[PDB]
Structures are given as structure tokens and as C-alpha cells.
């Protein structure tokens, strides 16, 4: 295992990763 | 006539290696490569 948007509501920015799930799966 | 462009990150050149039961590939030539590694001490 939204909580990601809930953290952004209090002023905490969550940066998205550079390699997405499709890009990581392609490397694998 | 140049500007900043946005694009999806390329995952590299796509090369599908052939596969067969009786097929094999052996190198006919080689090379001596010298690289550089920087490790702080």
C-alpha cells in the first residue's frame, strides 16, 4: 500500500519521481 | 531559430536480439577500453 494530496494540503510538497512505473518496468 | 522543447524521456534504443536453438554469436574482434572512476576519499 488520498494521503499524498493530504500532505500537500498542509504545505508539504511531494515531488513525483523521474522514472514512472512504465519506465521502471521497461528497464526490468 | 532554437527554443526549449518538452518531450517524454527516451528509454534507449530498442534492439530485439534474435533467438534460436542452433544459433550462436561469438565475437570475432575485441578492444581494450580505459575508463575513469572518481571516488572521494
Curated annotation (Swiss-Prot), chain B:
Glycosylation sites: 21, 29
Origin superkingdom: Viruses
Residues of the full protein shown: 689 to 729 of 1273
Function: Precursor of the fusion protein processed in the biosynthesis of the S protein and the formation of virus particle. Mediates fusion of the virion and cellular membranes by functioning as a class I viral fusion protein. Contains two viral fusion peptides that are unmasked after cleavage. The S2/S2' cleavage occurs during virus entry at the cell membrane by host TMPRSS2 or during endocytosis by host CSTL.
Organism classification: Viruses, Riboviria, Orthornavirae, Pisuviricota, Pisoniviricetes
Protein name (Swiss-Prot/TrEMBL): Spike protein S2
Amino acid at each position: 500500500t488520498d494521503l499524498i494530496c493530504a500532505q500537500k494540503f498542509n504545505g508539504l510538497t511531494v515531488l513525483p519521481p523521474l522514472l514512472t512505473d512504465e519506465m521502471i518496468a521497461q528497464y526490468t | 531559430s532554437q527554443s526549449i522543447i518538452a518531450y517524454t524521456m527516451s528509454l534507449g534504443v530498442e534492439n530485439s536480439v534474435a533467438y534460436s536453438n542452433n544459433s550462436i554469436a561469438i565475437p570475432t574482434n575485441f578492444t581494450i577500453s580505459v575508463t575513469t572512476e572518481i571516488l572521494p576519499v
